[PDB]
Scaffold this active site. Structure first.
Site, PDB file in Angstrom:
ATOM      1  CB  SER A 122      -1.557   0.017   0.582  1.00 42.87           C
ATOM      2  OG  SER A 122      -1.771  -0.218   1.921  1.00 42.87           O
ATOM      3  CG  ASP A 163      -6.840  -3.137  -3.131  1.00 41.81           C
ATOM      4  OD1 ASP A 163      -7.257  -1.845  -2.635  1.00 41.81           O
ATOM      5  OD2 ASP A 163      -5.590  -3.272  -3.177  1.00 41.81           O
ATOM      6  CG  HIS A 198      -5.650  -2.784   0.308  1.00 41.03           C
ATOM      7  ND1 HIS A 198      -4.888  -2.406  -0.530  1.00 41.03           N
ATOM      8  CD2 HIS A 198      -5.112  -2.356   1.496  1.00 41.03           C
ATOM      9  CE1 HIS A 198      -3.936  -1.808  -0.207  1.00 41.03           C
ATOM     10  NE2 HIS A 198      -3.939  -1.433   1.161  1.00 41.03           N
TER      11      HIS A 198
HETATM   12  P1  LIG Z   1      -2.369   0.910   2.765  1.00 37.33           P
HETATM   13  O1  LIG Z   1      -0.955   1.703   3.364  1.00 37.33           O
HETATM   14  C1  LIG Z   1      -3.300   1.797   1.980  1.00 37.33           C
HETATM   15  C2  LIG Z   1      -3.611   3.280   2.185  1.00 37.33           C
HETATM   16  C3  LIG Z   1      -3.040   4.134   1.083  1.00 37.33           C
HETATM   17  C4  LIG Z   1      -2.382   5.644   1.381  1.00 37.33           C
HETATM   18  C5  LIG Z   1      -3.070   6.881   0.932  1.00 37.33           C
HETATM   19  C6  LIG Z   1      -2.266   7.775   0.397  1.00 37.33           C
HETATM   20  O2  LIG Z   1      -3.092   0.339   4.104  1.00 37.33           O
HETATM   21  C7  LIG Z   1      -3.275  -1.086   4.363  1.00 37.33           C
END
Ligand SMILES: *[PH](O)(CCCCCC)OC
Ligand SMILES: *[PH](O)(CCCCCC)OC
Ligand SMILES: *[PH](O)(CCCCCC)OC
Ligand SMILES: *[PH](O)(CCCCCC)OC
Lengths: 315, 315
Positions: free
Chosen positions: A161, A256, A286
């Site tokens: 992510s 996702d 996700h």
């Molecule tokens: P990830 O780190 C998803 C969130 C994206 C960040 C936005 C800029 O969480 C499991």
């Protein structure tokens, strides 16, 4: 549709919500962090033994950056091909501890060293502090490779992510500054575009572990209101030129919201003539890459990411 | 751009041409087979040691089908996850001997058994005989898995070019017949569409190892006059339904006329919700997967294909 294992997990989460356990998006960031970090630690598969785990820190731009090095079982060479790993958690949650089992498994399956980075988190350190730390971790390890037991010719970056976004941005930043960048980028369901909502961001706004409300809670902590959403540190998909970026592995989950912009990033790499491996894991959500206590598909994804990096580095 | 190692090989080819060697497309098929088969044997990397090599044959539709089993180093289990491998050569050339080093490397890197199939070749046995043998080899080994030291739950098919086409068609055939199909399909620069010329088939008609003249020489031997070019055994890309097809690895070479239809096949699998890994190796040519004496990229491709299959099978 969803795999049975995935439905089982979404059902548990729905049972906790009806059981009165609060939405993450209803809490102060530091309170949410403590609670969700424990669930992430608990949500990983049991940590496999590795040859050696090392803890240290080095001087970052604005603070000490903690790191953890994982030496893979059965590898004896002093200088190892090395993955610099950036944990996910929307730039707000996660740390070395939440991704420890995953990094151990990646190290063992790839026969590469993994160095997990404890970068500064929002809201205490908003954009661009997290990416600055990611970039500084790569530059420090690149320039001091022998200190880290790293072969400088085989230095990868990767993450899940936000960590995937970080890895993509580290590669672009090095390319744009005209310095030596990573040999390889492992992008696990990265966020690549904050400027637009893809079909997948709409279709999976709710019902799929990472919900729109969660992304807004992360967003309000990480990004100052005045920020250009086409900034390449928020939206690396919008890069004009993808040439000179390192060989890539890009993984999406079927359910996702980030799937479409993950796959678009792979498409830009392929069209630019970058050696690119793209994989889609349908029927999972996700987070599955690190929720490996619940989702066996995550252990498969771990092994595929590791195996592809290992093969690129001739381990 | 072509990689240096690729330009080195195209230079050697050009040195043979201006001098003693004539064009493959100027010879009778059976005499051309002898000359190009020797170059293919000579073009493979030195054969790595495996745990065990087994030679046998079983009754095919119309003939004895010879097979060669490769047991990977360091695997002790009686029943192994198993790749049934179909060599390339336009359904005209190649055999177990031309792909022996590659199958040995795939076995060792995947920790899976490889069973290389010596299917009937055109022009002696034109379409549909080669595919009939491919299908019959999969069905025979599926139904007699324990006899082949194969875990029936983990039976993959794969191949390069024609062999890739064969593996794609075996999967469709099992799906369309409503029988147990392969657990996995490894498609190395497959031919997926004989009905249309992609941008890549035009762009790379000449200058890059398999020229359009080579494809016509293969075509003349393999396909009887007045065959429907939309037949799914020649053109599996044209399948209306890709659902229920097994998880896939699809590899293309950048300077390969087959690149576009290879990538299109991966696209159809991804859109149908099949777990799919797509990789493009830019700057290399059709054949690089088995020309590993000259092209290091081929050894990297070998290890990536092996590692992804190994990860899917939890080896
Ligand atoms: P990830 O780190 C998803 C969130 C994206 C960040 C936005 C800029 O969480 C499991
Ligand atoms: P998100 O969509 C994640 C929670 C999973 C519940 C399954 C229906 O929050 C509503
Ligand atoms: P491959 O097997 C070439 C693909 C052509 C298939 C149609 C005859 O090796 C050059
Ligand atoms: P094709 O394009 C095969 C390329 C060989 C390179 C030098 C002969 O034949 C024109």
């Amino acid at each position: 549709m969803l795999l049975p294992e995935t439905r089982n997990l979404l059902d548990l989460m729905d049972a906790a919500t009806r059981g009165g356990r609060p939405g993450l998006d209803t809490l102060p960031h530091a309170v949410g962090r403590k609670a969700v970090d424990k669930m992430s630690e608990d949500g990983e598969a049991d940590p496999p033994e590795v040859a050696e785990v090392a803890n240290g820190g080095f001087a970052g731009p604005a603070s000490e950056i903690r790191f953890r090095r994982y030496r893979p079982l059965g590898e004896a060479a002093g200088l190892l091909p090395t993955l610099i790993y950036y944990h996910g958690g929307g730039f707000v949650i996660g740390n070395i501890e939440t991704h420890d089992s995953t990094c151990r498994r990646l190290a063992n399956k790839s026969r590469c060293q993994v160095i997990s980075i404890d970068y500064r988190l929002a809201p205490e350190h908003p954009f661009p502090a997290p990416i600055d730390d990611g970039i500084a971790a790569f530059r420090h390890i690149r320039d001091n490779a022998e200190s880290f037991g790293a072969d400088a010719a085989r230095l990868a970056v990767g993450g899940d992510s936000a960590g995937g976004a970080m890895a993509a941005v580290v590669c672009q930043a090095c390319r744009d500054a005209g310095e030596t960048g990573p040999a390889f980028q492992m992008l696990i369901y990265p966020a690549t575009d904050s400027s637009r909502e893809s079909a997948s961001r709409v279709a999976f706004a709710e019902g799929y572990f990472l919900s729109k409300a969660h992304m807004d809670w992360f967003w309000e902590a990480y990004v100052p209101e005045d920020t250009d959403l086409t900034d390449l540190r928020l939206s690396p998909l919008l890069a004009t030129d993808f040439t000179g970026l390192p060989p890539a592995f890009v993984l999406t989950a079927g359910y996702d919201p980030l799937r479409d912009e993950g796959r678009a990033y792979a498409d830009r790499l392929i069209e630019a003539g970058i050696k690119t491996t793209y994989v889609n894991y349908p029927g999972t959500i996700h987070g599955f890459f690190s929720l490996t206590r619940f989702l066996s598909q995550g252990l498969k994804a771990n092994d595929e990411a590791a195996a592809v990096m290992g093969a690129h580095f001739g381990t």
